[PDB]
Amino acid sequence: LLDISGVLYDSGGTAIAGSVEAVFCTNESAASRAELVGQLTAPAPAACQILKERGLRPYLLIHDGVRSEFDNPNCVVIADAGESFSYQNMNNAFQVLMELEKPVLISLGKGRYYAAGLMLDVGPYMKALEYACGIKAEVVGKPSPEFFKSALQAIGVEAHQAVMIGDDIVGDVGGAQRCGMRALQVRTGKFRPSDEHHPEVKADGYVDNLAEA
Amino acid sequence: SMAPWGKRLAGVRGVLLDISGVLYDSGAGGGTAIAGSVEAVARLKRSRLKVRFCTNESAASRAELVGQLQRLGFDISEQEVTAPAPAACQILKERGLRPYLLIHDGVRSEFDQIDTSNPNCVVIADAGESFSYQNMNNAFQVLMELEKPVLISLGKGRYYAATSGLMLDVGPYMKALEYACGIKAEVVGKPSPEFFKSALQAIGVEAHQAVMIGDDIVGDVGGAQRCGMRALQVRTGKFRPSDEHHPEVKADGYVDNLAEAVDLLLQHAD
Ligand SMILES: [Mg+2]
Ligand SMILES: [Mg+2]
């Protein structure tokens, strides 16, 4: 299983050297799959399924590029929204949640940041609403075990015979290991030196890039 | 039920007042007085009770805030207000800190005599519309390059009431950076004990003879009680009915508004 941002490419985007020739379980939510795949398993379709099953109608706190994936709100769906994380948009999501009988916040990933310099990801804004509303988000995407399992099922491979490759030490590496996989940390993308000596997560191996992997 | 109000308010010589949600609710064109609160302040000033405003207000400078309130009819001077910006400025000076200011323009004047150039920390306040992704990201990028990252937050409130509904305050954006950077903010303002103590010292009243009146069950009420004061929760401002049955904080009393609090104080307090 291959992470995309920080492994194949960095958005902005630009291919990481050696990664095109070296060649997917992604939390990408700024762009639809079609748009991402054009630029080159994702959380939006898995979210769509969960919404349908529960009669949930989302207020979408998202980037315009992923809106296609969701083609009287009773929950909020928050993604890697970037510039769309205006105060107006955040406040509107907040005010929706604060009027619900049963407030539900669905988050597409919980990454802290990604490399582009370093950029704030969905996670910090997820935490803002959790604190503001006094609720816990449901995370669809990595490191949720159902996300990894769906990606494994798509290729017909069990966890003990699979390896995840990623730049996010907790989200990718820790997450995959928790599901019974092996996992490798790349030193491209969001990687910082401390991630190789992380107090909680010891990757099964550390590699400079996808090519070395 | 509750102990008699006369027991509950016995010995109170001083009053710390929250502003937003207690005197007024902010909004476009200077906000709106809460009914009965202008006259309640007047009645307090006339009494022998000592009065201090203990506010986390950080969207506007004290001069601007005090101007807005005076224009609504309040009897209030800058000398009577304890607010976070000056306390933050003192701390920045004592530690050689130079802040990147994640703030509304209206409070920028408060930091006029601080060097923000070559910033070695971030100060986050109630920034409202200025919580753009760009500004949040810039603050984030400043913190991530620092050897020793320091985040100073002017309050940690979740939300406050405004004319346009409940609004996201400083706290949620504080929590965002804490998560993004992997650090804990230093909170200057309520409910930090030093903040309440500075306000008590300004009026020469000890905590066991003081009462805090506020709309924020954790920040105002829980905070004050943790410093040894009594505290009353108002039902105006950001108050929701679940706040009267809060699992952690049991206010010393609940009142509909400042007017009711003042009726009770002048009836039962010193
Ligand atoms: Mg990645
Ligand atoms: Mg208040």
Tell me, what DSSP letter sits at residue A2? B
Tell me, what DSSP letter sits at residue A16? P
Residue B52: what are its φ and ψ, rounded to 5°? -135, 135
Provide the sign of the torsion angle of the four alpha carbons B214, B215, B216, B217, taken in this order: positive
A103 CB burial (10 A radius; 0-12, 13-18, 19+): middle
CB pairs under 8 A between A and B: 78
Q: Choose the mutation target among A62, A107, A110, A127 for the interface with B, i.e. most B CBs under 10 Å.
A: A127
Q: Which fold has domain B5-83+189-270?
A: Rossmann fold (3.40.50)
**CATH pick for B84-188 out of 3.40.50.1000, 3.90.1150.60, 3.40.50.2300, 1.10.10.10:** 3.40.50.1000
B34 within 8 A of B25, measured Cβ to Cβ: yes
Count of CB atoms situated within 10 Å of the CB of B145: 11
Residue with tokens 């989200």, as numbered in its chain: A171
Rounded-to-integer distance, Cα B197 and Cα B206, Å: 9
Binding residues of B for substrate: 18-20, 55-56, 190
Superfamily of domain covering A1-56+141-213: HAD superfamily/HAD-like (3.40.50.1000)
The b/e string for A174-200 (b: 16+ C-beta within 10 A; e otherwise) is bbbbebebbbbbbbbbbbeeebeeeee
3 state SS for B231-267: EEEECCCCCCHHHHHCCCCCCCEEECCHHHHHHHHHH
Tell me, what DSSP letter sits at residue A5? B
Rounded-to-integer distance, Cα B74 and Cα B39, Å: 8
Secondary structure (3-state) at B172: helix
Domain limits of chain B? 5-83+189-270, 84-188
Residue with tokens 């929590």, as numbered in its chain: B175
> How big, in percent rounded to 5, are the helix, strand and coil portions of chain A?
40, 20, 40
Tell me, what DSSP letter sits at residue B147? S
Cα diameter, chain A = 52
Q: Which ligand is nearest to the CA of B17?
A: 2
**Half-sphere exposure for B64 (CA within 13 Å, toward CB):** 16
Alpha-carbon distance B26 to nearest alpha carbon in chain A (angstroms):
16
The b/e string for B180-206 (b: 16+ C-beta within 10 A; e otherwise) is bbebebebbbbbbeebbebbbebbebe
Rounded-to-integer distance, Cα A33 and Cα A44, Å: 9
Solved with:
X-ray
Q: Which ligand is nearest to the CA of A80?
A: 1
Rounded-to-integer distance, Cα B211 and Cα B232, Å: 7
B98 CB burial (10 A radius; 0-12, 13-18, 19+): middle
A49 within 8 A of A138, measured Cβ to Cβ: no
**Chain B residues with CB-CB distance to A under 8 A?**
127-134, 136-137, 140-141, 144, 158-159, 165-168, 171-173, 175-180, 182
Residue with tokens 């001069």, as numbered in its chain: B63
Please tell me if the domain spanning A1-56+141-213 has the same topology as the one spanning A57-140. Answer: yes
A122 within 8 A of A79, measured Cβ to Cβ: yes
Alpha-carbon distance B268 to nearest alpha carbon in chain A (angstroms):
36
**Chain A residues with CB-CB distance to B under 8 A?**
81-88, 90-91, 94-95, 98, 112-113, 117-121, 123-125, 127-132, 134
Count of CB atoms situated within 10 Å of the CB of A69: 22
Secondary structure (3-state) at B176: helix
Terminal-residue alpha carbon distance, chain A? 12
Please, which residues have CB within 8 angstroms of residue A38's CB and are 6 or more apart in sequence?
none
Please, which residues have CB within 8 angstroms of residue A206's CB and are 6 or more apart in sequence?
A184, A185, A187, A196
Structure tokens at B102: 């994640």
On chain B, the residues whose CB falls within 8 A of the CB of A86 are 132-133
Distances (CA, A) of B28 to A48, B159, B164: 38, 17, 9
Q: Which fold has domain A57-140?
A: Rossmann fold (3.40.50)
User: In this structure, what is the dihedral angle of CA atoms A174, A176, A180, A183, given to the nearest 10 degrees?
Assistant: -80
**Contact across the interface for A131 and B171, Cβ inside 8 Å:** yes
